[PDB]
Structures are given as C-alpha cells and as structure tokens.
Amino acid sequence: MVVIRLARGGAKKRPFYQVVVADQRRARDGRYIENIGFFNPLAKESEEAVRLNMEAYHAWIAKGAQPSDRVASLVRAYNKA
Amino acid sequence: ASVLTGRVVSDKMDKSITVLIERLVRHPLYGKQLRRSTKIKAHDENNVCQQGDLVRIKETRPISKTKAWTLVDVVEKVE
Amino acid sequence: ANTAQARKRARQNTKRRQNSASQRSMVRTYLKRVDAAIAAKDYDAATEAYKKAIPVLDRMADKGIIHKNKAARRKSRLNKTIKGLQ
Amino acid sequence: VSSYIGGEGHNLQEHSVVLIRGGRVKDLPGVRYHTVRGALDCAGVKDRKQGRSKYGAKKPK
Amino acid sequence: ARYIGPKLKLSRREGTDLGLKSGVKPYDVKTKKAARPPGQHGVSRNKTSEYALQLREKQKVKRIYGVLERQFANYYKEAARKRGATGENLLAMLESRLDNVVYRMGFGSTRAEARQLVSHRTVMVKKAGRDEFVRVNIPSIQLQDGDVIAIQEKSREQLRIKNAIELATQRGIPEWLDVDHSKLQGTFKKAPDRIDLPAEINESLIVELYSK
RNA sequence: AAACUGAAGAGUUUGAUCAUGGCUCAGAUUGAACGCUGGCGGCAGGCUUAACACAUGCAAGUCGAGCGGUAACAGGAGAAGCUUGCUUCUUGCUGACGAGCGGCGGACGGGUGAGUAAUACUUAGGAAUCUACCUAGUAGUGGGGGAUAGCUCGGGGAAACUCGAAUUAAUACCGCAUACGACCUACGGGAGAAAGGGGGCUCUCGCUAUUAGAUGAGCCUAAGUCGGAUUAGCUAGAUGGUGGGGUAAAGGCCUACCAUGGCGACGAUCUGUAGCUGGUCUGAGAGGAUGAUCAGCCACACCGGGACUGAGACACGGCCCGGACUCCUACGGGAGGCAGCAGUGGGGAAUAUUGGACAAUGGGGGCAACCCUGAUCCAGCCAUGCCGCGUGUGUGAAGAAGGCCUUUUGGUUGUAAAGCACUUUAAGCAGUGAAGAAGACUCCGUGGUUAAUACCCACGGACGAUGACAUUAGCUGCAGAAUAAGCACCGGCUAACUCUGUGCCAGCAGCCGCGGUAAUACAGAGGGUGCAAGCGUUAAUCGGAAUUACUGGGCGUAAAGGGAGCGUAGGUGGCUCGAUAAGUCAGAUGUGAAAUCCCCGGGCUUAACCUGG
RNA sequence: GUUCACCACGGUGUGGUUGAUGACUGGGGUGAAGUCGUAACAAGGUAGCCGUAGGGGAACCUGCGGCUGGAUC
DSSP: OEEEEEEEOSBTTBOOEEEEEEETTSOTTSOOSEEEEEEOSSOOTTSOOEEEOHHHHHHHHHHTOEEOHHHHHHHHHHHOO | OOEEEEEEEEEEETTEEEEEEEEEEEOTTTOOEEEEEEEEEEEOTTOOOOTTOEEEEEEOSOOSSSOOEEEEEEEEOOO | OOSHHHHHHHHHHHHHHHHHHHHHHHHHHHHHHHHHHHHTTOHHHHHHHHHHHHHHHHHHHHHTSSOHHHHHHHHHHHHHHHHTOO | OOEEOOSSOOOOOTTOOOOEEEOOOTTSTTOOEEEOTTSSSSOOOTTOOSSGGGTTOOOOO | OOOOSOSHHHHHHHTSOOOOSOTTSOHHHHHSOSSSOSSSOOSOSSOOOHHHHHHHHHHHHHHHHTOOHHHHHHHHHHHHHSSSOHHHHHHHHHHHBHHHHHHHHTSSSSHHHHHHHHHTTOEEEEOTTOSOOEEOOOTTOBOOTTEEEEEOGGGSSOTTHHHHHHHHHHHOOOTTEEEETTTTEEEEOSOOOTTTSOTTSOHHHHHHHTOO
C-alpha cells in the first residue's frame, strides 16, 4: 500500500528525517511518490523541528495512504500547537 | 493525440501506406539544421490515397507489427 | 528447498497444481466439444454443446482456473461462430 | 619487458620477484620501466641518505 | 600542523617584519639581521623572478597569520567565490580568524601565543544574538559582526595576558575592535577594511600566484 | 537582494632570426597502489582483477483469535508410593507449543553488471490492460457433500526419503441455492460466488461479486543515444490483409489462405565494444573524459531449458528436466550453488570483522502480546580521502659549545639551544552527564456504536515500560613540556647553494641534458626551499594544446587543391506583391524525481558534514 | 500409460572470421677505428627532380615526355 513515513538522512548519529509518501515495498530511502515535509529529532528551541504539508497529508489520507506510527504522532504533536 | 503530416512514398500494401515525415534536426555541436525524414507506416482502411499525396496521420494503438498510425486527412493529391 | 516453509510451499504447490490441472483439462474438453461441433457445421449440435460449455467455462473462470476475460472471450467468439452457422 | 635498476648496487638475480613501475630511461633504447627498490625482493640502496624513499631505504636511526 | 622552529629567519627570508616577536624591543636590535636572508649565502646574484615575488608575498601573508597551505588555499577559494575583490576578502578572512582577533585585541603578545591561548580553551566566544559564551579551542574560527570574546574565569589573572594588554596599549588598538581591559572582554564590531589594513601587503601578488 | 566572476605560459630544431611543427613541463582530479615516515578527532570511502571456486555461521518468517491436536515446556486440579515434607501419575484443564493441514509473506528488502547497440535508457506522449494489502461505496456471506495431512497398522530404503491399507478437522476442496453490480447475448434471455473466527443480539477481523480511487505492473509511439564501409546490400512469418487461435491487454504473438511486400549511404546488414541516467572529473566557456559510493531504470542469480503457485515470478537463499563441478554412499542411489552479510582459498599492485542490536527509521506476520529482519542503526580495521587540532608559549647574547664554510679569522646554524617564566588543546586519569524515545501497557473522561451504563472505534488526560551504540556527546577537575615530524627538492623551466668524494666510472634524468681531476646536475654533508601527518613516485583523465580550431586553425613555397571536366544525391541560391506559420521569436501551461552544482540562510565549538528556501 | 507435435542438451559435415606459433624469406630501424664506391648539396664537376621503360655490385645510369623548385648566359 501507500504509506507516509520517514526517510532517514542527516549523518551518523545526527538523523534528519524527511516525511515522504511512498509505496510500501520500496526501500526506506529509495523511490517515493511525494515529499511532504521533514523532521529534526535533534533541534534547538528556536528552530523548525517539524514541518508537514497538511493539505497534501489530508489528500493522501483520503486517497488511501496509511501513516506510520511515527509520522502519525508527529502530526498529533504538530497540530496541537 | 499526435498528428504528423507528410507525403505518401508507398501505398502498395492493402490498407497500408508509408508516409515520409520530414523533420529538421539541429546538429548538437555545429548548430546547423539537417533535413531528416522517417518512414511511418499508416492505416489506409479504404485504400483511398495513392503514392505522392500529402496526407496527415495520427497516432493510435497498434494495427499490425509496424502500423500504429492511421490516416486522418488527405489534404492534397499528386499532379 | 532450504527452509521448512520453502518445502511446505513446494508440496503445497504440487497439490494445488494437480487440483487445478484437472479443472483446466475439463475446460479444454468442454471447449473441444464445441469446436468439433463447429468443424462439423451443425448448428443444432454446436448450440447443444455450447450450452454445456457455458456453465463450465464461467464456473472455472470464477474458480480462477481461467481468467474471466478468457471465459468472456471464448463465450463471445464461440457464440459468434455458432450463430454464423445459419 | 626490460626494466631499469636504479641506485648504486642491487641484489637482483635470476628468478628474483620484483615490482615494476613506469618511466623510461632516456638513453636506454627499449627500457620503458623502472624496478621499485625495497618493494618485494629488490633491496633498498645500502647507504642512501638523501632521496631514500625513491630507493626504498629505511630511515637511519 | 603549525610552524614550530625559529621565527626570525622567517622575517629574514621575507625581508620585512612579520610581528613574530612581542614588541618588547625593536626588530632591528632583536636580530641584528634582516639585511640578509637566512643561511650561508643570503644576498645573492641571479635576480628574483615574478614567480619568486608571488611566492614570497604569499609566504609573507601565510607566516604573518600562522596559516598553512591547505587552509590558506581554502581561504583563497572562498575569497574568490565571495562577491567582491578576492584579495580583499582573503585579508578579511585572515583578520577575522579568532586567534588573530584575540591578538589584535591584545590578550596575546604575539599571534602564536594568541593561538596557543585560544587552543588551550582559555578564550570564550559569544556569537551575535546568542546569550551564552562557549569555550572554543579552534583557532581558525571566523567571527561575524558583533561577536563577543571573553577570558575563561579560571584564567583571567594570567601573568602573560596582563602584559600582552600593556603591550597592545603601546602597539595600537584597531577601531573595529572594542576592548574592555577591566572585564577582559572584546567585541568584533566589524570586519577590517583594506584602508585599515597596512597597504604594504600586495594581495594582487597572491591573486596572480593562485591563477596558474 | 543573490544565484550573473572568467582565460598566463616555459624549454627544446639555428652561428643567429622569424615562422611552422611535434615532443616535454608547470595545474586539477582518484574507490588508487608503491617507497619513506606517521599523533589525534569528525565525516565519508574501502575486490576497480576471477559473473573464479567456495569451508562455517547467520541473511524469511509469522499466525493457536482458521484446524485436528500435545512432541517438549511451564503451571493447575485431583491419584497423594507420602519416602512427612519426601513426592509422583492421570488429565490440552491452562500458559503455550515441535511436527502437520491452512492463510499471509517469501516477486519486497539485499547483491552483481555477465548479457544487452536496443523486448535497454532519457525525454515526451498514447490506449487495448491487469492490479494482493490500502481508501470510499454497492449486493451478499444460504444450505449440503465427499475427502485428506498429521495420528494409526504394515512394510521398502545406508541415507535422501518412500510404498500400501485404514482414517479425523478446517477460513482445505467440490456440488446445490440465490446475484446491486460484473460476464455472454441473437439482446428474447442465458449462465457465474462465498467461510468462518473473535469480544461482550450486537460490534469486529474476515470471505464473495463488483464500481471508483490510489499504488504497482504489462503494452505502444516519436525523438535522442559508441566505433568500423579495409562491412552495401539485408529480409520469406519476411512486409501488409482476411478468417481462426492466443493474451489480462494492442500486435505475425501463432496459424491457414491472399498479395508482393518491408528495411537501407538520413548507414540497413554484419562486426567490435559497452549496462543507461541523474550525475562525476577537467575546462573561462564550448567542449573532452567518465558512469565507484547516493538515487532512478534495466538485466542477471553455477550453465541451458520448461513451467507451477500466485495479485504479482518464468522466482537470488522455490519446483522439474538436462549439463559441468564439489561432496556423501552400504555402490543401489543421493545432496549442493555467498553476484545477501561476515569469512576462506585463489587471482592481483591493491581493498576491511567469521562484531552488536532490533533502541531508532522501515519491511513481513499477528487482534494484540510478541516474533523475524546481516535492510537498517551502530561498532571494528585501514592516513584511502576531505576537514579540523596538536606536537608547546614568551623571554633569552661577550651571539656558548659542536657541525659547516672561510681570505684563519670571521660568517653561518641562530633566540636557535641552554638558563629563566609560564600554558595544558589533543592523548592519559577521575568524575559528572544530555539528546537520540516516538510515553507502550494500565487507569479515568468524552464522543461514536449498540438493546445496552458492555465490546469495539476515535479523541483527551494521568502514569513512566522501553538505548545496541555506551565506560556516549558535552561539561568539570588532576598531572606535567611532559606523549607526538617527516618527506621531496635546491643547473634551467622551478622557490632554494656551497664543500668533500668520484673522475664520461659510479651514477642522475620529465625535457634540455649532467659526469673528462677544482661537477651549484652523481653520492655524502652543512645550509636552504616547499609541503607537512603526511611527502614523493607510478598509473589514469582533462588542461595547458587555437595540437581536429563550433566558440577557435590551415592548404603558392612549411603538411595540405582532386590531372581536368560533366554531373547524381545533397548543400546553397535574384527582385516585387500576397497566402501559410513548419523553422525562428515571444508568452502561457504541463513536465524536466530527489540528491548534486550555485545563491541566500540555519545546526554541529569551527570546518568538513547536515539542512530550509 | 501409450503415441504424435514442439523443443533443450548432445552429435555430424562443410565453410567463414580471427589469435598464437612456423623452416625459410622480404624490406624497416639501431649499433663502431668496417669494405666498395662518390649519387645529392656549388653549374657538386654529365643541372637537378617527376612519371615511365630498360640496364646495372651499389649509390645509380640511359631513353622518352614534363617541370624550374636551374648556374651561366
């Protein structure tokens, strides 16, 4: 199925995830359908740690995409603010 | 769709014509344009056009091993 | 096969394939009946064989032995050729 | 092929396993390679002091 | 790495004073040389060439700031990538180096001592906007506009900074730096200008050396 | 605002000159090797050769909430020999669970580049298709049957395994019954499903037929896409058509018949080489070279061939047949495939550990609990690269001694040393110590659901179960200059010069050349120059080379006008008034993946690196 | 099960392309106190060179035609 998950980038011991819509069978960092945000696990209090296009996220939800438990909680903690 | 225009260089098949599609292609290094032509086999269901006519063909699904274009408009006949 | 599940899938494949081959052969013989009737040019016999080929064709197509598209194609084409026999 | 043994003195003989690099000798016709001194069986130059790495000579202590 | 050997023969090879010794006494009596470069021969025949001039100027700047070739070539690469005159930008970077800034602010008698002061985690830096000092040990840290420099509380009473200050008083304090001796603090208010830096370093020679 | 910035020449033909013209050099780069040397850290990279052969371990399982069950295991209830606190035998009763039937997965993820010059790739489009899981709907899920694996009974086999009789369950299999859609229709009518499980009549996980999405896959078209003509003609299912078959689907995909077509100097055919791309290197650019690591596409899985199951494979760790090779064998027969991760042998100039954890991001299974995951996240080794830091810092002269040179007395090594005064980065020792974690479970409340205050779903709180790395990053103390410098070069190009030895020898050398008894060119020493934990050499690409010249060269005599003409294809082409809008120009729209490059910012102490636009 | 069709391995025959080697043989180059001459450069001592033919140990010579990239005139 289509999933919304995180593709790891950054560097060793300093991850930086990209929130991507992807075919489930593809590699985590491989081919994806749309990049709809990012996530900085380690970040400073005065810097954007989570950005995520809500319109495209909702479009893919209605369309059939299944978020992972990480991106789902990321939206959970990003829309409550 | 996609429509090409060219002369009929062959018609001696049943429901089939070859169309000469001229094109200008620019040399990647020397900048001049060279006249280039491709022969496209088209479908001539009613066997109307003869060789030498200027016709228009349009892309369709394959009809035969090498035929995927069909005649859509005969615009001019030979003299 | 190197793992237990690979071996199990192998023997399962054998059983499934025998079961399906019997039904594929049945489809082929009910179609050969209609083909022989058509080759004889006998409208009555062709229709009578076609009426028994129909509920085997589209029943094994539902089972998956052939595709629904194949069953529909054979149904339509055999009916066309039979109706062509006066 | 023919290769040149540079430096003063060498231990090479028949059936000696040597390492060969590029670089022709200007005044030797047909010699287009140099023998690496200190590589496999070609010993370095004994009392070399200045350009020792070019002749596989260890640093005197 | 860094140069460790004798420093006055560097100035002797350059033919000028590189500030490699504290200004406790004039450069002339400090060496009784600098009429001739180091070694046996010194004053030679077979006059220098354009490449010799370019190399000597580049080595002059490199030895002034204690920076080696790989770092200095990255400096030139960035200076030519940056908008503006390449030599001006290279001099601006070399003057914005943290060890040179603490030297110019007077906490080290010479640039080598200022570098060894920065490297030993005795100098703290506060980036503009940040409300916190951090102890840094990287001498080649560039400072932006408004960066603050301070001395670690553990080493504010140093018997070498307490005369580096009085020596900087006799040598002269740049305007683009603001120094408070009482609190042993400084501010890098602006990168220095080519009209403030001495007009005896020919950076055109470096820019023409770095063009094959 | 910005992305808009970029271009050097020298030596060598001559007695000398100018030109021509080759050769050589200074630069940058590398998955590099080698020689000498070697302190540390961050981040990357690491079999380019034998798609050679592979010992050993691991790389794909999971579900008992589909099923019969009970091999082990742990309990629980009773039999209690009770041996009085020893202790056993019956029971699937429970947690669970080996093998077995069943489902889902194993078609992904991972590897390699052999084949492939085009069923490939890139760009742009198309129509004649299928699509498990996921999203939203629609119609249902009714009622029967015959089996069978395990389990038995008896054999055969050295093993691998196997043969027969009996025989139980199911969401296994097969009829029958209905059918909103769906399929065929001559449009009158015909035929086609399914399966149950779970929580307290409901809800839920399922199953069936199907519609629209989304995803993925298959198919088609046009253009672009290496060298050779000392390869010019190539094709007979060939090119097109009809009827038939075949496919999920167009189609000579196949077949019978009919016609004689199709392709080719705009390079067919035949040959050599090769995975293609984003990109990478070089270059002022245009170009030239290239296709490691990261990402897309393709192909392959010991070699050849065939298919099965399935939504998807003609299947890397599946099947069958054949082959070569290795192994086992009781000689009758059997087993296997590291181009998964480690690792071995071998080849090579040359490329690493038979490490840890699923904590994080993902993937498979499951209602969950949880299990699996050599993907991945980490750790190990290696100066292989890039970046950063250190090996101390000041002061110190009748300018000590020693070395070297010298006009024999001066110069030089040189503030260099010593002596004094300090400092402790990195390494070491001791402490402290974030972040990577997403808050599982449980409890409460709210809303939906319902016959229901249940169950389930979602939302909101409380709670702290969860870290391989790891003795973390960082931070703070202690000690003491203590633990830390080599390499190449020094005639010119090309920065840096003298002695001694040697005597066209020994040797050097990229080129020009040097070496003959006073060698700044050999070898050693002083001194210096350039780089610096590296420095040289070799290999290789571009550059300089305007030396294939498009940008941007030439042909009277330096290389170079065909012996001359006629002419085919092709290239190019007068004046004026119109049409057209193909080229051309402009605009809009869609696309040109991301990463990379460049510009503006942001985060690691800086930088490398990461990252937003 | 049998039989036919298709087909992989394997086999047979006849050619093509191409690598390595081959007695011997051809020219090309490099090497020094060699042998034989002296063909070219000056009008190089018969101007040279080009095509072609014949001849000659060898540079070459001779004929025919051509050229000036020929002195002297």
